[PDB]
Amino acid sequence: ELFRSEEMTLAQLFLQSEAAYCCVSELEELGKVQFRDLNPDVNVFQRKFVNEVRRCEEMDRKLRFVEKEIRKANIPIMDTGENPEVPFPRDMIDLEANFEKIENELKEINTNQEALKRNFLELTELKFILFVAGVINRERIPTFERMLWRVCRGNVFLRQAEIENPLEDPVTGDYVHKSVFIIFFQGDQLKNRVKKICEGFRASLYPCPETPQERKEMASGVNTRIDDLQMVLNQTEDHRQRVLQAAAKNIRVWFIKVRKMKAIYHTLNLCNIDVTQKCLIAEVWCPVTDLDSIQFALRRGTEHSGSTVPSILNRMQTNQTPPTYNKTNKFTHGFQNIVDAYGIGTYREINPAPYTVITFPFLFAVMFGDFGHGILMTLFAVWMVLRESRILSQKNENEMFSMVFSGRYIILLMGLFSIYTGLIYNDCFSKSLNIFGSSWSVRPMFTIGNWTEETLLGSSVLQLNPAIPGVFGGPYPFGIDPIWNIATNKLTFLNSFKMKMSVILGIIHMLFGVSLSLFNHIYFKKPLNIYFGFIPEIIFMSSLFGYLVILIFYKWTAYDAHSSRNAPSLLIHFINMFLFSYPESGNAMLYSGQKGIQCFLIVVAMLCVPWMLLFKPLILRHQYLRKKFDFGDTMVHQAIHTIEYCLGCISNTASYLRLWALSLAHAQLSEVLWTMVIHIGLHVRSLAGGLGLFFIFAAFATLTVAILLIMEGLSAFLHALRLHWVEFQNKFYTGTGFKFLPFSFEHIR
Amino acid sequence: ALSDADVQKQIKHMMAFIEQEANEKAEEIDAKAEEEFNIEKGRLVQTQRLKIMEYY
């Protein structure tokens, strides 16, 4: 039983536009039906939903306008709920207008407020202007004065006045000291001159000075009036704020409801209008599960509409290439997305995602087999999960944070397996895991074997521990014996093992992917795809690549150190296998008769090729002409496919050497970063050593995060994902599908 | 969750719906025809009755 996509039907439903209105409401909130466009040649003007959409767009813009002003004012409006009710009466148009009135009112008030504000400032100047203190900006009054004398120097007294504690500049918007020079002139030419000057200069010298009491009384009058107008302004602004808060709540909720309204009308445009009755027929692609739920939903919808129209949905026997619908949940959604990132699978294709959930973390764990960082990696994921409720119910404009959050459950699992593999490798920041099981060698017996005081010469030598001295042997209980973690030749013992491991795992993973192709070939009833496809392809791979894997295990179990000199090399035998090179002597064979097996397997691998290479189009021609197909073109397709499979298996095997390459590369970073950073921080001097470790470690931990936890973890993520997409999926996960886009109530916020 | 019989029943229902509208619309048309019939007749009968009446 494999997971496959859900069915999407070709059914059509037909019913009255009123029942359709209600049903669309119901189906959109249900979210389980994907509609088809019944009139591809018809524009929105042609659908005749343009009046409804336009209305929606206009009220939408108006609401947004008001909302923007509301947001500018920093109002608390929680926008807490009621949104789920989603009614859509035609009376919404009237609701819209009432909200339109608010916009107009608010704009009018602000316009008036600004106007009143301006008047206030001018009257404020008058307050100061009434002896009399005129108003200037006085940025460069030295020059104003000079220009005044240039036009006539020294003719009239310049009276100075100053403003104590000036308030916010009507223009500048700040509080500066102000002082003014006011000159009374008898001549008209000078009045005109200085008018032009003052216009050029940063100054307000507009009213005429008056000494008469009457003007002082006038100024007092207007100074009172403006105070009253300011009080009115203050009142209208407080009212506006009260209005804005109430509207903020009503509008945020209505706003969402409106967005849903628009969504409904949009969907309603995507239909065909009947001629016989004012009814629409619409087509949806839905699986039976959903179709039963929908029928019930339809009864609910039509019941909300006053007409309770039966609304018949007719199943379509004919099947139309559907979108691919994959049900996901909070955990598996992320894995499906990284699959979809490569492409949308063929309808009824085997979904790779259920296998990715484990396969991908495993490939990472091999690439990132680091026990210590595996823990840190999980802790990072846990942090995100612990804030899951706080991150979801908040704004997240940072897309990189959102992405890693969405992948938080992927990361956690990746860490989980990375710990597993790091534990077996026994590397935790280049630290081994001592289980008291290290019995590789018995040092006491080393000295007995004619090594007396070797530690004296040892000052200039290392000396490699011999195999099979009669006193050494026995595996480490779990994983690699910790002793190799401090060896100078770990770089051959452990590097070789990981090399062989990567090859073995890569081949197995490919064979798994191929095995899945058999199930796909069964589902689509293509016997030919296995008779000349699966069978000769898997025979090719087994005979060459599975044989190699068997030999690797054989070597480990067949030969001991007793034959270490000129020990058989699996690389050379593998090469000689392919080339049919069978020297009589000079090279030890793994087992007697190996040459016969080597020749047998390669010949058989060739014998399967004709089937996969050309017999498929050959039999298709046979069957085609008997039943009665571009034979030449089909030969081209199959020949290319055969080359890709056969050559790709060889290339794909190399691809999985990334497991070794990245595991080694990481191991090199960990060993070097430790050795050249924290190790040097240690010293025989007590206090200096302790304090040094503090500062050095802090930097060390920083480098481990910057280099390994982030950058390398990201690299291993990408490389393991590469293997999934190219080498695994390409064995069975083929073709493309369409995006599954049902009606849904997405506009919740 | 419907069989051929159930979908056919709902189709039959929709057709009954159409027949119901057919009847209501026709009745509405004949009713206005009746109104115009009576209005024109009363107008005509009084007009000529009075014309010959006034002559006499």
Short mmCIF file of N, CA, C and O in Angstrom, two decimals, chain A residues 504-595:
data_model
loop_
_atom_site.label_atom_id
_atom_site.label_comp_id
_atom_site.label_asym_id
_atom_site.label_seq_id
_atom_site.Cartn_x
_atom_site.Cartn_y
_atom_site.Cartn_z
N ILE A 504 27.84 1.56 -0.52
CA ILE A 504 26.83 0.55 -0.21
C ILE A 504 25.47 1.20 -0.06
O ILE A 504 24.45 0.71 -0.59
N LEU A 505 25.41 2.29 0.71
CA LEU A 505 24.15 2.97 0.94
C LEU A 505 23.61 3.58 -0.34
O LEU A 505 22.41 3.51 -0.62
N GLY A 506 24.49 4.18 -1.15
CA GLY A 506 24.02 4.78 -2.38
C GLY A 506 23.38 3.75 -3.29
O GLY A 506 22.29 3.97 -3.82
N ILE A 507 24.04 2.61 -3.46
CA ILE A 507 23.50 1.57 -4.33
C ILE A 507 22.17 1.08 -3.80
O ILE A 507 21.22 0.88 -4.57
N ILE A 508 22.07 0.87 -2.49
CA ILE A 508 20.81 0.38 -1.94
C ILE A 508 19.69 1.38 -2.18
O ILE A 508 18.56 1.01 -2.54
N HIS A 509 19.99 2.67 -1.98
CA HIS A 509 18.97 3.69 -2.16
C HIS A 509 18.47 3.70 -3.59
O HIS A 509 17.27 3.81 -3.84
N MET A 510 19.39 3.58 -4.55
CA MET A 510 18.98 3.52 -5.95
C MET A 510 18.10 2.31 -6.21
O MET A 510 17.06 2.41 -6.88
N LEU A 511 18.50 1.15 -5.69
CA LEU A 511 17.72 -0.06 -5.90
C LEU A 511 16.33 0.07 -5.30
O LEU A 511 15.34 -0.41 -5.87
N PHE A 512 16.24 0.73 -4.15
CA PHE A 512 14.92 1.01 -3.58
C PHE A 512 14.08 1.83 -4.55
O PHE A 512 12.93 1.49 -4.85
N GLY A 513 14.65 2.94 -5.04
CA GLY A 513 13.92 3.78 -5.97
C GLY A 513 13.45 3.02 -7.19
O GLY A 513 12.36 3.25 -7.70
N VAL A 514 14.29 2.11 -7.68
CA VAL A 514 13.88 1.32 -8.83
C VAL A 514 12.76 0.37 -8.45
O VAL A 514 11.77 0.23 -9.17
N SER A 515 12.89 -0.30 -7.30
CA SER A 515 11.83 -1.20 -6.87
C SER A 515 10.48 -0.50 -6.83
O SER A 515 9.45 -1.11 -7.16
N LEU A 516 10.45 0.76 -6.42
CA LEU A 516 9.19 1.49 -6.39
C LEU A 516 8.58 1.65 -7.79
O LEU A 516 7.35 1.78 -7.94
N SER A 517 9.43 1.65 -8.81
CA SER A 517 8.93 1.82 -10.17
C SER A 517 8.05 0.65 -10.57
O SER A 517 7.15 0.80 -11.40
N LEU A 518 8.29 -0.52 -9.98
CA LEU A 518 7.44 -1.67 -10.28
C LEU A 518 6.01 -1.42 -9.83
O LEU A 518 5.06 -1.78 -10.53
N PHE A 519 5.84 -0.85 -8.64
CA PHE A 519 4.50 -0.55 -8.17
C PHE A 519 3.82 0.46 -9.08
O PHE A 519 2.62 0.35 -9.37
N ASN A 520 4.58 1.45 -9.54
CA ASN A 520 3.99 2.43 -10.45
C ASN A 520 3.60 1.78 -11.78
O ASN A 520 2.56 2.10 -12.38
N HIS A 521 4.43 0.85 -12.25
CA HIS A 521 4.13 0.16 -13.49
C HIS A 521 2.88 -0.70 -13.34
O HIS A 521 2.11 -0.87 -14.28
N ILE A 522 2.68 -1.27 -12.15
CA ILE A 522 1.44 -2.01 -11.92
C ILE A 522 0.26 -1.08 -11.88
O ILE A 522 -0.78 -1.35 -12.50
N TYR A 523 0.36 0.03 -11.16
CA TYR A 523 -0.80 0.89 -11.02
C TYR A 523 -1.34 1.34 -12.37
O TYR A 523 -2.56 1.40 -12.55
N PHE A 524 -0.46 1.67 -13.32
CA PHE A 524 -0.91 2.17 -14.61
C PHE A 524 -1.06 1.08 -15.67
O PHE A 524 -1.25 1.40 -16.84
N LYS A 525 -0.97 -0.18 -15.28
CA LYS A 525 -1.23 -1.32 -16.16
C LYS A 525 -0.40 -1.23 -17.44
O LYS A 525 -0.92 -1.24 -18.56
N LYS A 526 0.91 -1.13 -17.26
CA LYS A 526 1.88 -1.08 -18.36
C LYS A 526 2.80 -2.29 -18.23
O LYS A 526 3.97 -2.15 -17.82
N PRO A 527 2.32 -3.48 -18.58
CA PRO A 527 3.16 -4.66 -18.45
C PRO A 527 4.45 -4.52 -19.20
O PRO A 527 5.49 -5.03 -18.77
N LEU A 528 4.41 -3.78 -20.30
CA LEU A 528 5.60 -3.62 -21.13
C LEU A 528 6.68 -2.85 -20.38
O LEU A 528 7.87 -3.03 -20.64
N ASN A 529 6.27 -1.97 -19.46
CA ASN A 529 7.25 -1.15 -18.77
C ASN A 529 8.06 -1.99 -17.80
O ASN A 529 9.12 -1.56 -17.34
N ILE A 530 7.62 -3.22 -17.51
CA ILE A 530 8.45 -4.10 -16.69
C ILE A 530 9.06 -5.21 -17.52
O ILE A 530 10.20 -5.64 -17.26
N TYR A 531 8.34 -5.71 -18.53
CA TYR A 531 8.86 -6.77 -19.38
C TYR A 531 10.15 -6.40 -20.10
O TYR A 531 11.09 -7.20 -20.13
N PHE A 532 10.22 -5.20 -20.69
CA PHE A 532 11.47 -4.69 -21.23
C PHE A 532 12.08 -3.53 -20.47
O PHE A 532 13.14 -3.05 -20.87
N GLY A 533 11.45 -3.06 -19.40
CA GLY A 533 11.99 -1.96 -18.63
C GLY A 533 12.55 -2.43 -17.30
O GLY A 533 13.74 -2.70 -17.17
N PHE A 534 11.67 -2.52 -16.30
CA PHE A 534 12.12 -2.82 -14.94
C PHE A 534 13.07 -4.00 -14.92
O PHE A 534 14.16 -3.92 -14.35
N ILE A 535 12.67 -5.10 -15.56
CA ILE A 535 13.42 -6.35 -15.41
C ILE A 535 14.84 -6.22 -15.94
O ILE A 535 15.79 -6.48 -15.18
N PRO A 536 15.07 -5.83 -17.19
CA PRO A 536 16.45 -5.73 -17.67
C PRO A 536 17.22 -4.61 -17.00
O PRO A 536 18.45 -4.67 -16.93
N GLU A 537 16.53 -3.59 -16.50
CA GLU A 537 17.23 -2.50 -15.83
C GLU A 537 17.75 -2.95 -14.47
O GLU A 537 18.91 -2.68 -14.11
N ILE A 538 16.90 -3.63 -13.70
CA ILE A 538 17.31 -4.10 -12.39
C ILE A 538 18.33 -5.22 -12.52
O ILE A 538 19.22 -5.37 -11.67
N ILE A 539 18.24 -6.01 -13.59
CA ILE A 539 19.27 -7.02 -13.82
C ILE A 539 20.62 -6.36 -14.05
O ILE A 539 21.62 -6.76 -13.45
N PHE A 540 20.66 -5.33 -14.88
CA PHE A 540 21.89 -4.58 -15.09
C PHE A 540 22.47 -4.12 -13.76
O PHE A 540 23.66 -4.34 -13.46
N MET A 541 21.64 -3.45 -12.96
CA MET A 541 22.14 -2.85 -11.73
C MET A 541 22.57 -3.93 -10.75
O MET A 541 23.63 -3.81 -10.12
N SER A 542 21.79 -5.00 -10.62
CA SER A 542 22.13 -6.00 -9.62
C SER A 542 23.46 -6.65 -9.95
O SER A 542 24.38 -6.64 -9.12
N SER A 543 23.62 -7.09 -11.20
CA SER A 543 24.78 -7.85 -11.63
C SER A 543 26.06 -7.06 -11.47
O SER A 543 27.11 -7.63 -11.14
N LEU A 544 26.02 -5.75 -11.68
CA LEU A 544 27.23 -4.95 -11.55
C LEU A 544 27.38 -4.37 -10.14
O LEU A 544 28.38 -4.60 -9.46
N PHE A 545 26.36 -3.67 -9.67
CA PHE A 545 26.50 -2.90 -8.46
C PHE A 545 26.23 -3.73 -7.21
O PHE A 545 26.94 -3.57 -6.21
N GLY A 546 25.24 -4.63 -7.23
CA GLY A 546 25.04 -5.48 -6.08
C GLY A 546 26.19 -6.44 -5.88
O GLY A 546 26.59 -6.73 -4.75
N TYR A 547 26.75 -6.94 -6.99
CA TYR A 547 27.91 -7.81 -6.87
C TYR A 547 29.03 -7.10 -6.13
O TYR A 547 29.65 -7.67 -5.24
N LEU A 548 29.30 -5.85 -6.52
CA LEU A 548 30.36 -5.11 -5.85
C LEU A 548 30.13 -5.07 -4.34
O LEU A 548 31.04 -5.34 -3.55
N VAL A 549 28.90 -4.76 -3.93
CA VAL A 549 28.58 -4.65 -2.51
C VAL A 549 28.84 -5.97 -1.80
O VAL A 549 29.36 -6.00 -0.67
N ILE A 550 28.46 -7.07 -2.43
CA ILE A 550 28.70 -8.38 -1.82
C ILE A 550 30.19 -8.58 -1.61
O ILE A 550 30.61 -9.09 -0.57
N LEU A 551 31.00 -8.18 -2.58
CA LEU A 551 32.44 -8.39 -2.49
C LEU A 551 33.03 -7.60 -1.34
O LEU A 551 33.97 -8.05 -0.67
N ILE A 552 32.49 -6.41 -1.09
CA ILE A 552 33.01 -5.57 -0.02
C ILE A 552 32.83 -6.26 1.32
O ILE A 552 33.74 -6.30 2.16
N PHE A 553 31.63 -6.79 1.56
CA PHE A 553 31.40 -7.51 2.81
C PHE A 553 32.24 -8.79 2.85
O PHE A 553 32.81 -9.13 3.89
N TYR A 554 32.34 -9.48 1.72
CA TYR A 554 33.17 -10.68 1.67
C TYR A 554 34.60 -10.35 2.11
O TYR A 554 35.17 -11.04 2.95
N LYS A 555 35.18 -9.30 1.53
CA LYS A 555 36.55 -8.95 1.89
C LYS A 555 36.67 -8.76 3.38
O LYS A 555 37.60 -9.28 4.02
N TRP A 556 35.74 -8.02 3.98
CA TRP A 556 35.81 -7.77 5.41
C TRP A 556 35.77 -9.07 6.20
O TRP A 556 36.47 -9.21 7.21
N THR A 557 34.97 -10.04 5.76
CA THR A 557 34.78 -11.27 6.51
C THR A 557 35.68 -12.41 6.07
O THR A 557 35.83 -13.38 6.82
N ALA A 558 36.27 -12.33 4.89
CA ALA A 558 37.07 -13.43 4.34
C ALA A 558 38.54 -13.35 4.71
O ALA A 558 39.14 -14.38 5.03
N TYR A 559 39.13 -12.17 4.68
CA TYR A 559 40.57 -12.05 4.86
C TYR A 559 40.87 -11.32 6.16
O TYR A 559 40.23 -10.33 6.52
N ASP A 560 41.88 -11.82 6.87
CA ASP A 560 42.42 -11.16 8.04
C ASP A 560 43.79 -10.58 7.73
O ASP A 560 44.29 -10.69 6.61
N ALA A 561 44.39 -9.97 8.75
CA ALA A 561 45.71 -9.37 8.57
C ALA A 561 46.72 -10.40 8.07
O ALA A 561 47.78 -10.04 7.56
N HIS A 562 46.40 -11.69 8.22
CA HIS A 562 47.35 -12.73 7.83
C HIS A 562 47.72 -12.62 6.36
O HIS A 562 48.77 -13.11 5.95
N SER A 563 46.87 -11.97 5.56
CA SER A 563 47.12 -11.76 4.14
C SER A 563 47.19 -10.28 3.80
O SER A 563 46.97 -9.87 2.67
N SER A 564 47.51 -9.45 4.80
CA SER A 564 47.51 -8.01 4.57
C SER A 564 48.52 -7.60 3.52
O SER A 564 48.32 -6.59 2.83
N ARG A 565 49.61 -8.34 3.38
CA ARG A 565 50.60 -8.01 2.37
C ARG A 565 50.14 -8.55 1.03
O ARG A 565 49.90 -9.75 0.87
N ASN A 566 50.00 -7.65 0.06
CA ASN A 566 49.42 -7.99 -1.23
C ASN A 566 47.98 -8.46 -1.07
O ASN A 566 47.48 -9.27 -1.85
N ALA A 567 47.29 -7.94 -0.06
CA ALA A 567 45.90 -8.29 0.15
C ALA A 567 45.09 -7.91 -1.09
O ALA A 567 45.37 -6.87 -1.70
N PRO A 568 44.11 -8.71 -1.49
CA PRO A 568 43.30 -8.35 -2.65
C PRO A 568 42.65 -6.98 -2.50
O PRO A 568 42.13 -6.61 -1.45
N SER A 569 42.70 -6.23 -3.59
CA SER A 569 42.10 -4.90 -3.66
C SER A 569 40.81 -4.96 -4.46
O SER A 569 40.82 -5.29 -5.65
N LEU A 570 39.71 -4.60 -3.80
CA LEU A 570 38.42 -4.67 -4.45
C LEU A 570 38.32 -3.70 -5.61
O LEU A 570 37.61 -3.96 -6.57
N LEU A 571 39.04 -2.58 -5.54
CA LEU A 571 39.01 -1.62 -6.65
C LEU A 571 39.60 -2.23 -7.91
O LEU A 571 39.07 -2.06 -9.01
N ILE A 572 40.73 -2.92 -7.76
CA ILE A 572 41.40 -3.49 -8.92
C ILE A 572 40.60 -4.65 -9.48
O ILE A 572 40.49 -4.82 -10.70
N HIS A 573 40.03 -5.47 -8.60
CA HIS A 573 39.24 -6.60 -9.09
C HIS A 573 37.98 -6.12 -9.79
O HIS A 573 37.56 -6.70 -10.80
N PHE A 574 37.37 -5.06 -9.27
CA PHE A 574 36.21 -4.47 -9.92
C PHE A 574 36.56 -3.94 -11.30
O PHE A 574 35.83 -4.17 -12.27
N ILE A 575 37.69 -3.24 -11.41
CA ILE A 575 38.10 -2.77 -12.73
C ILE A 575 38.40 -3.95 -13.64
O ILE A 575 37.94 -3.99 -14.79
N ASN A 576 39.14 -4.94 -13.15
CA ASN A 576 39.48 -6.08 -13.99
C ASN A 576 38.23 -6.85 -14.38
O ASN A 576 38.15 -7.40 -15.49
N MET A 577 37.23 -6.89 -13.50
CA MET A 577 35.96 -7.50 -13.83
C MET A 577 35.40 -6.90 -15.12
O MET A 577 35.17 -7.61 -16.10
N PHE A 578 35.18 -5.59 -15.12
CA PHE A 578 34.57 -4.94 -16.27
C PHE A 578 35.38 -5.17 -17.54
O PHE A 578 34.82 -5.36 -18.62
N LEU A 579 36.71 -5.15 -17.42
CA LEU A 579 37.57 -5.26 -18.59
C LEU A 579 37.86 -6.70 -19.00
O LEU A 579 38.60 -6.90 -19.97
N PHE A 580 37.32 -7.68 -18.28
CA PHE A 580 37.60 -9.10 -18.51
C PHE A 580 39.11 -9.35 -18.46
O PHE A 580 39.64 -10.12 -19.26
N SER A 581 39.79 -8.73 -17.50
CA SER A 581 41.22 -8.93 -17.31
C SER A 581 41.43 -9.94 -16.20
O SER A 581 41.11 -9.68 -15.04
N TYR A 582 41.98 -11.10 -16.54
CA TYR A 582 42.05 -12.20 -15.59
C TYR A 582 43.47 -12.74 -15.56
O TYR A 582 43.73 -13.83 -16.10
N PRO A 583 44.41 -12.02 -14.95
CA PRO A 583 45.79 -12.51 -14.90
C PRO A 583 45.87 -13.87 -14.22
O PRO A 583 45.15 -14.16 -13.26
N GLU A 584 46.77 -14.71 -14.73
CA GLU A 584 46.94 -16.04 -14.18
C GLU A 584 47.51 -15.98 -12.77
O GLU A 584 47.11 -16.75 -11.89
N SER A 585 48.44 -15.06 -12.53
CA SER A 585 49.12 -14.94 -11.25
C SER A 585 49.62 -13.51 -11.06
O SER A 585 49.62 -12.70 -11.99
N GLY A 586 50.06 -13.23 -9.84
CA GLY A 586 50.62 -11.94 -9.51
C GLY A 586 49.68 -11.13 -8.64
O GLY A 586 50.09 -10.18 -7.97
N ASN A 587 48.40 -11.51 -8.66
CA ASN A 587 47.38 -10.85 -7.87
C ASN A 587 46.46 -11.91 -7.26
O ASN A 587 45.89 -12.74 -7.97
N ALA A 588 46.33 -11.86 -5.94
CA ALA A 588 45.49 -12.79 -5.21
C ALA A 588 44.02 -12.48 -5.47
O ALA A 588 43.61 -11.32 -5.49
N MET A 589 43.23 -13.53 -5.67
CA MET A 589 41.80 -13.37 -5.85
C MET A 589 41.08 -13.53 -4.52
O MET A 589 41.56 -14.16 -3.58
N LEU A 590 39.89 -12.93 -4.45
CA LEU A 590 39.09 -12.98 -3.23
C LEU A 590 38.62 -14.40 -2.94
O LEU A 590 38.55 -14.82 -1.78
N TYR A 591 38.29 -15.15 -3.99
CA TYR A 591 37.86 -16.53 -3.85
C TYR A 591 38.11 -17.27 -5.16
O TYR A 591 38.16 -16.68 -6.24
N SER A 592 38.27 -18.58 -5.04
CA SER A 592 38.51 -19.41 -6.22
C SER A 592 37.31 -19.36 -7.15
O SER A 592 36.15 -19.41 -6.72
N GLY A 593 37.59 -19.25 -8.45
CA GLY A 593 36.53 -19.17 -9.44
C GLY A 593 35.98 -17.77 -9.63
O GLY A 593 35.04 -17.58 -10.41
N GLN A 594 36.55 -16.79 -8.93
CA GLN A 594 36.05 -15.43 -9.06
C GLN A 594 36.11 -14.97 -10.50
O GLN A 594 35.21 -14.27 -10.97
N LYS A 595 37.16 -15.35 -11.23
CA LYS A 595 37.27 -14.91 -12.61
C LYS A 595 36.07 -15.37 -13.43
O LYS A 595 35.59 -14.63 -14.29
#
